[PDB]
Design a protein around this nucleic acid. Sequence first.
RNA 1: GAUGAGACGCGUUUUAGAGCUAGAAAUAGCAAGUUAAAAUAAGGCUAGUCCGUUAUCAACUUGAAAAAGUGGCACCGAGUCGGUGCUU
DNA 2: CGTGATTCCAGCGTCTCAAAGTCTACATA
DNA 3: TATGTAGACTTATATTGGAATCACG
Length: 1357
Amino acid sequence: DKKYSIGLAIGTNSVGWAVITDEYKVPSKKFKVLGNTDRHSIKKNLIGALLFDSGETAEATRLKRTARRRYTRRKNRICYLQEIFSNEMAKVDDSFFHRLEESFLVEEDKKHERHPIFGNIVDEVAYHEKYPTIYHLRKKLVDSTDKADLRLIYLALAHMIKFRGHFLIEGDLNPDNSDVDKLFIQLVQTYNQLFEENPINASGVDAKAILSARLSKSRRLENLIAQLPGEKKNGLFGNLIALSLGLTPNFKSNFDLAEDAKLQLSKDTYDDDLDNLLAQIGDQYADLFLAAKNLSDAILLSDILRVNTEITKAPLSASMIKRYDEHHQDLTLLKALVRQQLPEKYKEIFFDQSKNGYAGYIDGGASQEEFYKFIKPILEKMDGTEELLVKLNREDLLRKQRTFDNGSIPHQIHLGELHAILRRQEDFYPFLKDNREKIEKILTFRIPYYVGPLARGNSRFAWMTRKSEETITPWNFEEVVDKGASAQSFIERMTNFDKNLPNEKVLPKHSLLYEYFTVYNELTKVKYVTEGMRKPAFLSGEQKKAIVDLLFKTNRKVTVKQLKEDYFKKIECFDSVEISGVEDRFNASLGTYHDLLKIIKDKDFLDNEENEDILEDIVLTLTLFEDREMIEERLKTYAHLFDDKVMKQLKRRRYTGWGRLSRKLINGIRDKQSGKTILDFLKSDGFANRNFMQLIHDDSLTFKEDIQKAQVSGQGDSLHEHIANLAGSPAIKKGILQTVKVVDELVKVMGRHKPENIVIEMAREKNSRERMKRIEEGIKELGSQILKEHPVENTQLQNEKLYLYYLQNGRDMYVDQELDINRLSDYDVDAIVPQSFLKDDSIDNKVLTRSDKNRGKSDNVPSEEVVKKMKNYWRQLLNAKLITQRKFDNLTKAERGGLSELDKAGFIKRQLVETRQITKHVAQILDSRMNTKYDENDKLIREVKVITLKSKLVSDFRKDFQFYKVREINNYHHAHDAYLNAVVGTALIKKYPKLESEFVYGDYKVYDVRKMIAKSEQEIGKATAKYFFYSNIMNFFKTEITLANGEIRKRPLIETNGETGEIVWDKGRDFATVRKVLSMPQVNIVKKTEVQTGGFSKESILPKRNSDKLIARKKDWDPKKYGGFDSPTVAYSVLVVAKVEKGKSKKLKSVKELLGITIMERSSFEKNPIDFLEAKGYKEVKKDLIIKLPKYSLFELENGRKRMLASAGELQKGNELALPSKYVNFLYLASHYEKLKGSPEDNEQKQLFVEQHKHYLDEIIEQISEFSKRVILADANLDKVLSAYNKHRDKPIREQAENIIHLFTLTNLGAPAAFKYFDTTIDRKRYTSTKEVLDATLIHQSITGLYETRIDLSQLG
RNA sequence: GAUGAGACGCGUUUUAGAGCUAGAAAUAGCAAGUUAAAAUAAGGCUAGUCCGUUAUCAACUUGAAAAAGUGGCACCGAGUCGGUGCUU
DNA sequence: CGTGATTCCAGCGTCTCAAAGTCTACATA
DNA sequence: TATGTAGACTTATATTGGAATCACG
């Protein structure tokens, strides 16, 4: 069996796979083809790509699920309201509710009278005339005290409940006083009454504007205080204003109180918190705080409710009535003005629904903004519309009762109006008095966020727990739901578990055990040196215990001075001590210990370990919740242990935040031999004092083994669940799953022989304004005038050379001279650290100079000469933030620090390793699926080595050796990327085996940086273990080791391993082999078929029409009378071979056609296909001939023409256009697809090659035409493209190449799309017929497409 | 970063808002114009203040199904694989 | 009168939860 | 009066199929 390797490239839209061998040549095999087709043997290369639709997020599903939940909860609330009214309404009217529930049906299908409210035309007309809107009726029922018909009361209550407004506002503000100025004046009056000796002059203070301004509460407080000279924000009046604004002011200082008078109107405890305050200073100040609360309510009402009428109790219904009156008056005035001045526009404005006039604003789809935009010029053109123009500029011209800006309405206003109606109508209806609080509860009820769906399971989003098994109603939710228990489950489920131990609950941030762990972990590294001691010593167990007892348990924060003096001098009698570790202040602290010591006032209780767990259960309660009532309910279990004062003080104490390590990770697991936990080791570890990092990484302890055994595949019940649990986007996880299945299929393909290596690469998944700001700040800090002489826009800064020029302030970075913009093309861009040490494209890693030769010494950093010349200039640029600290250090690396071997190792590590961890998870999954056997030492046998590569290495490999990629040519680039990843990974691990530790999971481990770095100049790689003095990693591939000086160090034609001596690269035939691989016209492109799901149809209720395409919104709602949905998305088509009656002849004519199965009908079709098809009209269906065709089903026609089944009546182009490599390279070079990076001589050679191969352009177009004539069959589009190409033959080569790059989408795989050749627009050619594929060859393709099943549909039947 | 929940305001739609006069009618002219109720993905069985737009995957065989099983190799070339040898 | 070509058109805004960043003014040494 | 700290305000586009329309030989 020949050894082979598998390379894969992972993306969010594609998975590229490639199989390589010992020659780095893609193999080729014969694959059997099943089916009735004549062909039984085919040939396919082992490199290809798999294309699937990107994974879609679940946010849309979450929104369209919460929407259904809300629209089923509102209906239930309305039903409850009806249930309250059932008996009395039935006494008054027996068919009122049936009318209201059958109002939507037409008169023909109605079982009752067509007039809902009264059942007769006369009373309906009278009601509508008397009450044009529901708001008139609501206001009448609020203010008027006369008995009214029960139907009107029910209608008002229903309209109030069904639209109750938001619940954002906190607290209770049922009183409707909202005039800011009047309540501010009353507060000032009360303050002056209480404080006569110290009055406040509020004259000239615009309280309304200041308090109601759209600004922060603190900002408004400061503004208001600024208008009071002798008053401060922290004063009593300032604290009252802050409380009114929603802050939390402390009245302790104002009244010299011992108790901290913290009062917030949002907190539920305020009712007590105020009274307690009134207990100390008396009840004389109560009226002041009540005036403050009234002012707060007025401020909260602010702009949303702005009507000012004293008589009306309802402050919102009168607002709607005033709006309606303004609308009517403005309509009459505008109608008169239009009839007088512009009679020709009257019909267009008041009758054309298609326009954005009044007709379209009322009956059409025109919104308020569109109507304003359409009518502003007409009002400005006419006379007498000054008030109308003012209203338009104030967004109150011809407004409707319902609008877009009623979302600010707090539910308190609707609650108050409903309360007023109930108070005004309960005097005539006993049941309203009996059920007033029930209706108020219905209106105010709202399922708390921490309770969740009231579903007792039977779902995958419910966590609520029940106290009694009965129906939950808004009136009994407190006693039928275990709210306290359910809140704990909520908090726990949406809080991440310990990363090290997925099954262990994490600890609170302020937990006592967690604080002990943090202190000890840090304490296990402190040392002390004195006169008598020869060497600094680790703090022993007894020493650490004494330090904790004397310092950490007596001071919240322990400073280094405190450690030196209070312990070493007081106990150890040490006069001079040096402390290792942190200096000045210790970051860790036992804040919780001192906090509990202050409350309970029982030090022995805290120091007793027996209470430890209990204390934890307290701290958890202080962290788990924030509601004081729930905290009290939980802490009630420990009420016997502490006094009531202590219990209340604990209730007032609250916390937040979580740690990162679990309790079991601290004191749960124990080492096998020692029998000590992590905390036990931290308290005493002899003279080693190993910390947590050392403890969990020590091979001599079981902690590491236990962590490895626990964390490994904690979700490893299967492959789907393990990938799903991984943290990452849905698209990337779908790509991971497809890559794993591709690996399994490839392993099956090659005779069940595991490949030697698996290389994986995962693709990497405004700014001009930022650049402008940075350049402006740097120039203004530097004081230069370069912007005055050279204006520039933000977009122009996207050019690298111009951006670097402005960053350097028009000065050469290596020479103390100026640079010219118009000469930038003759200048040079040079890397500070050369390519020999680090291949990169970072802006900081680049410098704009007149000539690179001026860099002085080039072997190791720019010479000390340039540093001495312009280190001050570099520092000046650094201070202006024009260059970064890293760039400055690299520029001054000549003598800031000698060229470091550590820096070279860091460069190598940065180039090699992968910063992301998701790639590590993918590698672990692949390794666990491949490596399953163990050796004699019970260690894993790593038959398959999994390598992870970054895209930078492959991109640089592509750029160095003229192997270019153009993503918009075809989809082969994914497969080519996978192949190059495989080649690069295999070659890199064969050249330098020691890199396996960096590139493989587990087993192999690093040793140091000394053995990696070689000696100066060329060294013997084979003899000396030294591998690389220069810090490049891929320069062995190329034929010349370049340098910043331009010096050349040629390499042997054949590169081989130093020790083993095996040939790893033959530059004379391996590059040719790669070229031949990339030139292969046959590549396995298979689109992953995926049955479509989602919306039943487009979500837009279309108006009634005479067409069968409409889909009914309800079973009995005929689309011809009530409209319905349109465009049902087809889940998958079904090929049916049956007969249908031929109309009048009544003959069963044999037919074969594609029937689109919609998502709506999918379940019915799958339940019984025969009955569904017979209902559709087909007779004598061949059940065994039924073929399921999901979306993207592949069909082949004559001359290799391929199509994909996009739907039942539309097709997509199914062929790939394999362009020759030379044309691809010419298009890449000529169009400047990427930046023109490289030596100027190389750029000149590339330009010469482009100019000498201009004819390619024509040839390319010719090829495309032929491909169209072979695959596209779009005569009009092809002719237009040819005419456009012949039209712009005089255009520059770069522009023509760029247009051709975006001209390639004519035959791109997938759905057709319109494109632009220069200014010519070519629309997509759509294949609206699927008849031909009924006689083509259906090709079912595997995930890799190496196995294919070809069925001749024409041969069937 | 990945989820998950509780709320709102809309939007859309049919019917209700006797639209009128002069026309034989078509048509003309005139008046009014904001609101309401209902559904908001077909509905299902588990009858829930639940759930239905994310995740799954080619075909066949075995199977209800979670799933397993089902295809030679080398060689030269290369327009989306063509042929040769070997195995067979 | 099928048939190719042309055109439009698609449901959408807000808040809360729960998170840290950062000032800040009353304790605190 | 120079810090510690507890609190509290602040921050956190196009795609593509369907349907109609529209010419049209």
